[PDB]
């Protein structure tokens, strides 16, 4: 039996979980009451006859983001003790999720993780789902992962944090939270894929033609990407991909595990049957620089490895012909020490549609996670907004005064300097 | 007499071989339920080459199935001609070889080894004899390349006199999946030169090229990939199963096709391979089978033999053809283009004639030729290995799972001895 | 059992040769799906010459279709008697090479001759002597004259003593379509004089003139202009396929019509040709068939033989005849017209009686005549070539595809040489 555990935490935690678990229940024939009117084994359990209970560990510090699913349409879906919320949030403060309030909620969150992993037949992965420039997603994510690396320090840990954007922004403490939480994302994360919120914005504007996507429309696109990532773990397939196959084949040198992601086609109903969705065309839209779901324009980087997943009615002869055109395209270039490598899986089940959503019914899909060295330019803009706020010690007394000692800022700065550095002479 | 046991390994090994047991069972006339409907004695006179007998008259394939991941075990069992296999021949893991060569050879595939040698032993020891062991695997992956050749080494220890017919899928030159193609390929051809025998060559871009030009499949399938290999299965093992005029068992193939012990890489090919449009317009005679089988657009390897020289070659004719009509065609093809045959071995070709044609066709021929041109493939495996290894790529899996970079650099050093050895033999 | 490899090139050559394969299929009883229909042994024994033998049973033609535009071969395939052809001998190309001899000979057609010549080899070494390469192509387009010149050159260097006939159509003076036609002829004659044994010169004005003043057709078309060419080509190779009193094959035609090797541009003809009332009103005596060969009206050249001297003349008679009137009809035309015949050859004549007439008619003649009067063809092509080349009209799409201007000056130097040795030979 294949299984995996999802570790939604934060507002970007729970709300992405609401989009991904409505998707995973509809594609499996699982109703919100819980039961079905053999692919279920990786996202649901079998308590009794029917009632496929999900295997999320939905977690926050404040109750006002977990209470609407404790009283919502999916109330009788989750185990109610997998929905874990305290009384007061970390309030955009790493020290308020990592040193102060949070110890008395980690001991319950990893308590619930223990007796999910007990009823597992060989564990495969830990899908962590968090925000990174925020509060509970950064601090409580870092505590939960630093002590996930000791009691299950052998399984893969696939993080999907949402990085702060260069131009778009939401709070003044993005540099003061995401820069120092790369400690969690480097020495305790095995694959980290950043889904920047700015990129999900304009990818709805161009392709979906919605000028005005809300957070709910963003989370459905991410839910599609997870549904195509851990897809071979569910359905019958062609050339297959596991989480260990994803691990060993995309990833170069061990600290280098910061990757992009891209979906294709992300077309809407009008732009659906006016063009043929051939395998060659959908992988060109997968590779095109405006489709990366982080603003990381890959022409100013160095592609190292790409892992593509062709969900649906995709023929591998069309796949090999299509990726050959990617080699011949001089815009998309690759590093010299990785001369080959376009690791591609093909699932059979077509991508499912969310009723009331904005995506059209497409026979095919391409999900690409690639490791271009332009991902260091995320940290190049991010460090620029760190150093000049830290130059006169702005916002430092809310951190050194709560639970933390001064000095973590300087060595996390050294960590980002070495993170940009390790992406330089690898691509030289 | 002449027991050959399939040792199916890897994802690719189990659908290549599931079609092997789909075409061999068609030629010997066995339903998926296990009964026979062909009404002929000559069909049922060498069943023991591939089918052990079981109570109630039902045959079973002598076929150990082997994986680390049970998904492709489910696909073989569920498909047609799939519920003929013995259920404890289904020796599978629950973890999955993640395309890591260390993952098959030095960790978890190695704890399933004591179970897979047990089922190999049970279907090999109790008999009168066995001619050899047949093995299909998937060099470039995790399972067929990984513990797959660990089962090759241990069978070589247990029976170091029986022949190892290995149908291996080398990596594609043009493009393929699985970024760690070079790391699996060289480390596996390290031991496929010394615990080995005929290591014949099959490639995915190569076989694609037959089903675009030679067969004009507009939408080819992986099933069509396995069917062309499965046709070559019956050709290479035909005189062990059906009588002829000049019989040639599978060991007789090796002795007149290997000049020096490490020179054991063989292009495979099938003829006739005719498209439906050209089905009724062309004819079927020995000059046309010879022109098609030496044609490099037909060879199942992507190495082009015109950029080389045939050391020694062999052919498997099957039909009601004249043994004369074969042997001046061998003489004529040797005399016209003598530039592609070596001078230091005279008369570079063996011919075998089986009386019984393959299923359907009136006549067919299978080419097993030791051309020296295969260093097109081997230098392609080498020059991508030099790129990844020189800059230490992906090695934190291969050394962190229990090896060192000594084994990589001497797999490269064995590898360059192989391209050198073919070079002066040309 | 001598063979002819028939290669049709160009849009014009494909249409002319498709009319050839239906006037030789009804002459041999071949159905559109290849099956003999009657019960005559004389119609079938020499089927090896223009047809092969399939294990299906059908007599596929030994034809190689050859045209860079995949629209004309679609028309040949979908038309009647187009199901006979092998689909492998349909070498396509998808670029067009539109009305450019530079594109046909140096640009795009260069990477197509390496595939059409494989088809030529698959048809040619399938025997022990080939008789000739009957090639039909145009000299006014790009695919016809260009890649036609490629195929005539590489066939000759591979096969030095094999014949190759060339029923090529030359550009037309009075009204013609392609503007660069003098460029497409001057650059093609230069290789058509050094790599060719026989070039039967055909125009378009005199073929229109035949169906205007022998047939009185108010409605001709390109099909019936081709049916006259196909009837002429049938009678020339008639002794290779049918028995006769005095058999004379294609090589007999060559050795007895060329004084010296460059002077090999003949004139073709066919001379039973009746009008509407004049089918019942025309006698079928040998002297009248001799009368209709030696008329400027029934010449397929519009290069009037009265304005010139017959170097040598031959007539391939067909039908149930008297072997004496076949010769003194040649003797009387040489005596009553003695100034129209070269003095340094007594007996400028050959008669050759085959015994199988065309269907329906009682006799037939095909006149092949080496004349001085092909001077007029080359001198007006030189007049159209020099008028544009002196101001370099349209030159930069022949230099642009890759040439130099000396290739044009040498092409005119060979063809202004071609009018010269015909001039002291008069």
């Amino acid at each position: 039996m294949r299984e995996v555990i999802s570790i939604h935490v934060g507002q970007a935690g729970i709300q992405i979980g609401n989009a991904c678990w409505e998707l995973f229940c509809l594609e499996h024939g699982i109703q919100p009451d819980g039961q079905m009117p053999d692919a279920f084994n990786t996202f649901f359990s079998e308590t009794g006859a029917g009632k496929h209970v999900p295997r999320c560990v939905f977690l926050d510090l404040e109750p006002t983001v977990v209470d609407e699913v404790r009283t919502g349409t999916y109330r009788h879906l989750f185990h109610p003790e997998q929905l874990i919320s305290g009384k007061e949030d970390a309030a955009n403060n790493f020290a308020r999720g990592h040193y102060t309030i949070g110890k008395e909620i980690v001991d319950l969150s990893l308590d619930r993780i223990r007796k999910l992993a007990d009823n597992c037949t060989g564990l495969q992965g830990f899908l962590m789902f968090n925000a990174v420039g925020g509060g509970t997603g950064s601090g409580l994510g870092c505590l939960l992962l630093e002590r996930l690396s000791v009691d299950y320090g052998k399984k893969s840990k696939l993080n999907f944090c949402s990085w702060p954007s260069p131009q778009v922004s939401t709070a003044v403490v993005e540099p003061y939270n995401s820069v120092l939480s790369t400690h969690s994302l480097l020495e305790h994360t095995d694959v980290a894929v950043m889904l920047d919120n700015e990129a999900i914005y304009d990818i709805c504007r161009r392709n979906l033609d919605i000028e005005r996507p809300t957070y709910t429309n963003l989370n459905r696109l991410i839910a599609q990407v997870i549904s195509s990532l851990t897809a071979s773990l569910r359905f019958d397939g062609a050339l297959n991909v596991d989480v260990t196959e994803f691990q060993t084949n995309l990833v170069p040198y061990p600290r280098i595990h910061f990757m992009l992601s891209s979906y294709a086609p992300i077309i809407s109903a009008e732009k659906a049957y006016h063009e043929q969705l051939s395998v060659a065309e959908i992988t060109n839209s997968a590779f095109e620089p405006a489709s990366m779901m982080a603003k990381c324009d890959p022409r100013h980087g160095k592609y190292m490895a790409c892992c593509l997943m062709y969900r649906g009615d995709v023929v591998p002869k069309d796949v090999n012909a299509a990726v050959a055109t990617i080699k011949t395209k001089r815009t998309i270039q690759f590093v010299d020490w990785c001369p080959t490598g376009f690791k591609c899986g093909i699932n059979y089940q077509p991508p499912t549609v969310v009723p009331g959503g904005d995506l059209a019914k497409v026979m095919r899909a391409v999900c690409m996670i690639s490791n271009s060295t332009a991902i260091a330019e995320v940290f190049s803009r991010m460090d620029h907004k760190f150093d000049l706020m830290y130059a006169k010690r702005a916002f430092v007394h809310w951190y050194v005064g709560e639970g933390m000692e001064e000095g973590e800022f300087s060595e996390a700065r050294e960590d980002l300097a070495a993170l940009e550095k390790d992406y330089e002479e690898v691509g030289i | 007499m002449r027991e050959i046991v399939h040792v199916q390994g890897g994802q690719c090994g189990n659908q290549i071989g599931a079609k092997f047991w789909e075409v061999i069972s068609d030629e010997h006339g066995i339903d998926p339920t296990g009964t026979y409907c062909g009404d002929s004695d000559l069909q049922l006179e060498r069943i023991n080459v591939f089918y052990n007998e079981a109570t109630g008259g039902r045959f079973v394939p002598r076929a150990i199935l082997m994986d680390l991941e049970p998904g492709t075990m489910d696909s073989v069992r569920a498909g047609p001609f799939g519920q003929l296999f013995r259920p404890d021949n289904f020796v599978f893991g629950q973890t999955g070889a993640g395309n890591n060569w260390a993952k098959g050879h030095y960790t978890e595939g190695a704890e399933l080894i004591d179970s897979v040698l047990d089922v190999v032993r049970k279907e090999a020891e109790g008999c009168d004899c066995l001619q050899g062991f047949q093995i299909t695997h998937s060099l470039g992956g995790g399972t067929g390349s990984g513990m797959g050749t660990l089962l090759i080494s241990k069978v070589r220890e247990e029976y170091p006199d029986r022949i190892m017919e290995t149908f291996s899928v080398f990596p594609s030159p043009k493009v393929s999946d699985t970024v760690v193609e070079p790391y699996n390929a060289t480390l596996s051809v390290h031991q496929l030169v010394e615990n080995a025998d005929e290591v014949q060559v099959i490639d995915n871009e190569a076989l694609y090229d037959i089903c675009f030009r030679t067969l004009k499949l507009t939408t080819p399938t992986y099933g069509d990939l396995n069917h062309l290999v499965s046709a070559a299965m019956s050709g290479v093992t035909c005189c062990l199963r059906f009588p002829g005029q000049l019989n040639s068992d599978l060991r007789k193939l090796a002795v007149n096709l290997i000049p020096f012990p490490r020179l054991h890489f063989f292009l495979i090919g099938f003829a006739p391979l005719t498209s439906r449009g050209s089905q009724q317009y062309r004819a079927l005679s020995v000059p046309e089978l010879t022109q098609q089988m030496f044609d490099a657009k037909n060879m199942m390897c992507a190495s082009d033999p015109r950029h080389g020289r045939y050391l020694t070659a062999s052919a498997m004719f099957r039909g009601r053809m004249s043994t004369k009509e074969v042997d001046e065609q061998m003489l004529n093809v040797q005399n016209k283009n003598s530039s592609y045959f070596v001078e230091w071995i005279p008369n570079n070709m063996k011919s075998s004639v089986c009386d019984i044609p393959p299923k359907g066709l009136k006549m067919s021929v299978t080419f097993v030729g030791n051309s020296t041109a295969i260093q097109e493939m081997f230098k392609r495996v080498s020059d991508q290995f030099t790129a990844m290894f020189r800059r230490k790529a992906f090695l934190h899996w291969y050394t962190g799972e229990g090896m060192d970079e000594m084994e990589f650099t001497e797999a490269e050093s064995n590898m360059n001895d192989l391209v050198s050895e073919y070079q002066q033999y040309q | 059992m001598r063979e002819i490899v028939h290669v049709q090139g160009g849009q014009c050559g494909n249409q002319i040769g498709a009319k050839f394969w239906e006037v030789i299929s009804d002459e041999h009883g071949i159905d559109p799906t290849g099956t003999y229909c009657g019960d005559s042994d004389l119609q079938l024994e020499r089927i090896n010459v223009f047809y092969n033998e399939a294990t299906g049973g059908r007599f596929v033609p030994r034809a190689i279709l050859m045209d860079l535009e995949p629209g004309t071969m679609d028309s040949v395939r979908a038309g009647p008697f187009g199901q006979l052809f092998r689909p492998d001998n349909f070498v396509f190309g998808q670029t067009g090479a539109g009305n450019n001899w530079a594109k046909g000979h140096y640009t795009e057609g260069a990477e197509l001759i390496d595939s059409v010549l494989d088809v030529v080899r698959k048809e040619a070494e399938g025997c022990d002597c080939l008789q000739g390469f009957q090639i039909t192509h145009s000299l006014g387009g790009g695919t016809g004259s260009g890649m036609g010149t490629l195929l005539i050159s590489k066939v000759r260097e591979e096969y030095p003593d094999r014949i190759m006939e060339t029923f090529s159509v030359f550009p037309s003076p009075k009204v013609s379509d392609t503007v660069v036609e003098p460029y497409n002829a001057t650059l093609s004659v230069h290789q058509l004089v050094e790599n060719a044994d026989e070039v039967q010169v055909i125009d378009n004005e005199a073929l229109y003139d035949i169906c205007f003043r022998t047939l009185k057709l108010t409605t001709p078309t390109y099909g019936d202009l081709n049916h006259l060419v196909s009837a002429a080509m049938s009678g020339v190779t008639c002794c290779l396929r049918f028995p006769g009193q005095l058999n004379s094959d294609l090589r007999k035609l060559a050795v007895n019509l060329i004084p010296f090797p460059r002077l090999h541009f003949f004139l073709i003809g066919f001379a039973p040709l009746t009008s509407r009332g004049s089918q019942q009103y025309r006698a079928l005596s040998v002297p009248e068939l001799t009368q209709q060969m030696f008329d400027a009206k029934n010449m397929m050249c519009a290069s009037d033989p009265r304005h010139g001297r017959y170097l040598t003349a031959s007539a391939m008679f067909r039908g149930r005849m008297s072997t004496k009137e076949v010769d003194e009809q040649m003797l009387n035309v040489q005596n009553k017209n003695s100034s129209y015949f070269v003095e340094w050859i007594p007996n400028n004549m050959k008669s050759s009686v085959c015994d199988i007439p065309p269907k329906g008619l009682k006799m037939s003649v095909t006149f092949v005549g080496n004349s001085t009067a092909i001077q007029e063809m080359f001198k007006r092509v030189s007049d159209q070539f020099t008028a544009m080349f002196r101001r370099k009209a349209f030159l930069h799409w022949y230099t642009g595809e890759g040439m130099d201007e000396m290739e044009f000056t040498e092409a005119e130097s060979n063809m202004n040489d071609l009018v010269s040795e015909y001039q002291q030979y008069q």
């Binding site: 059979y348 | 067969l215 080819p220 399938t221 | 395939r77």
Partner: peptide
Amino acid sequence: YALRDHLDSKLVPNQSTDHTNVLS
């Protein structure tokens, strides 16, 4: 869902089952 390994070629490979005008 065995739709990848379609039998587009039977036991003999011979692949499985599946404008011009007039100048008369």
